């Protein structure tokens, strides 16, 4: 910016390595020297994908008979299957579908180790009682979602023509659940744990007969003694049954085999892209790398082989082969710059020139912009390493000189 504010000169900081240098010092004039700059990135040349492909995950149970009350929720656990939430959601009039610790787009598109679906009858009038922040009876004694795993909650109404789902007489819930200790002075509220059933489930009937019913069980000594007690409550039934569906997903306890179905191209196979840098998504595991055919190590049944820094370093494919996985590797870059001549050369340290006058292979890497001179110096200003030096022609190209 000039004094009058106009821009008269600029550097595109991603144009080349010399430009990166000027930008890092925020100046158009930097001192002579050899500087490290951002590496020349390897970029993906394609992608490989492997997903479980097969059986649909089965939501049929859900659709047949009278759903349980909130404290007796039923659980469907899906593993090793193709899921489709639209397939289930489309059967209900959804009133409220929200997600936590997972985006909306993600719930319907990511692969999981497992998907757990908890379904139950639930009045919509008590919607708020399922909130994480709630201190009412549902969240304290009946049903609580995980705080650790990503979850979604769907509240939906059963359509008049979905005749396979029947209604209970009333909606019901536990409004009290507690233990009376052996002294019969102290009463301890028994709160429901996330993803678990309340201890009072065994004393509370599948339908509370009437609001205010009190239940009691004498506990054995192995259960700590005393009494387990509970109180039920009811909500009048609606014209259409309202149901809640909790969804909990886990991301890495097993192969993430619960995936949306995918139509596979045969150009996304690993064997067809060996040696290339590709993006990968293997049963929910993703990143970038290069696959190589190699000797199997690790336990085959476990599929993914990890190193001591927890990187994925190998994989057993469903095509029967074991592949080594290497990172797409970046190519080191150092800029050799001479301020007086306004010239430069690029050193790719540690890199053979097969990956890059043409390029010159030197003891410290591959260098472009230098010409081999078979000349010696003592007075080296731009040392390259080992006993090599860049020597400006003064302008011409820099010479590669040896230090005497």
């Amino acid at each position: 910016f000039s004094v009058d504010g106009y821009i008269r000169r600029a550097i595109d900081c991603g144009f080349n390595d010399l430009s990166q240098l000027h930008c890092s010092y925020e100046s158009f004039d930097v001192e002579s020297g050899v500087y490290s700059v951002s590496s020349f990135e390897a970029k993906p040349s394609g992608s490989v994908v492997e997903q479980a492909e097969g059986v649909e995950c089965d939501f049929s149970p859900l659709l047949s008979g009278t759903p349980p009350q909130v404290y007796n929720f039923k659980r469907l656990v899906f593993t090793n299957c193709n899921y489709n939430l639209t397939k289930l959601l489309s059967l209900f009039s959804v009133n409220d579908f929200t997600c936590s610790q997972i985006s909306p787009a993600a719930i319907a598109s990511n692969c999981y180790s497992s998907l757990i679906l908890d379904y139950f009858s639930y009045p919509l009038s008590m919607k708020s009682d399922l909130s994480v922040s709630s201190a009412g009876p549902i969240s304290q004694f009946n049903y609580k979602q995980s705080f650790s795993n990503p979850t979604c909650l769907i509240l939906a109404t059963v359509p008049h023509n979905l005749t396979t789902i029947t209604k209970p007489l009333k909606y019901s819930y536990i409004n009290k659940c507690s233990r009376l200790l052996s002294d019969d002075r102290t009463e301890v509220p028994q709160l429901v744990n996330a993803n678990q059933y309340s201890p009072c489930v065994s004393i509370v009937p599948s339908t509370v007969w009437e609001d205010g019913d009190y239940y009691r069980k004498q506990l054995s000594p192995l259960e700590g003694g005393g009494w387990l007690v509970a109180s039920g409550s009811t909500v009048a039934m609606t014209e259409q049954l309202q149901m809640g569906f909790g969804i909990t997903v886990q991301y890495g306890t097993d192969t993430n085999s619960v995936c949306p179905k995918l139509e596979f191209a045969n150009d996304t196979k690993i064997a067809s892209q060996l040696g290339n840098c590709v993006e990968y998504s293997l049963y929910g595991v993703s990143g970038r790398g290069v696959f190589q055919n190699c000797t199997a190590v690790g336990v085959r049944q476990q599929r993914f082989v990890y190193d001591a820094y927890q990187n994925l370093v190998g994989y057993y494919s469903d095509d029967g082969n074991y592949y080594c996985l290497r990172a797409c590797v970046s190519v080191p870059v150092s800029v050799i710059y001479d301020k007086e001549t306004k010239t430069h050369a690029t050193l790719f340290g540690s890199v053979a020139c097969e990956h890059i006058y043409g390029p010159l292979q030197t003891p410290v890497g591959c260098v472009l912009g230098l010409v081999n001179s078979s000349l010696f110096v003592e007075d080296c200003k731009l040392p390259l390493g080992q006993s090599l030096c860049a020597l400006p022609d003064t302008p011409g190209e820099m010479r590669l000189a040896s230090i005497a």
Partner: protein, 97 residues
Amino acid sequence: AMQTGFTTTNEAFQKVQDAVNNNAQALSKLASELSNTFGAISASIGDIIQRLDPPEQDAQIDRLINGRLTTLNAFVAQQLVRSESAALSAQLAKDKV
């Protein structure tokens, strides 16, 4: 008698190995810290992006940034300490020669 002296009982020899080990330790900080999540759901930025929307995605990426910026500051601080020490030591070597 010294030809067979580069062993476990040679203090000067261990100092040579230790200088080598110190270089390795300096590099191990960078190699080992990228696997940490620093409270994030994943050490992978790609996993964060794939799973979360921007208002939460941001917070998770930011945890990884803070952890990595911290790691690099620690690394640099040590390279400066180690290079200062080596430079003083080099002047001692100069005097001994």
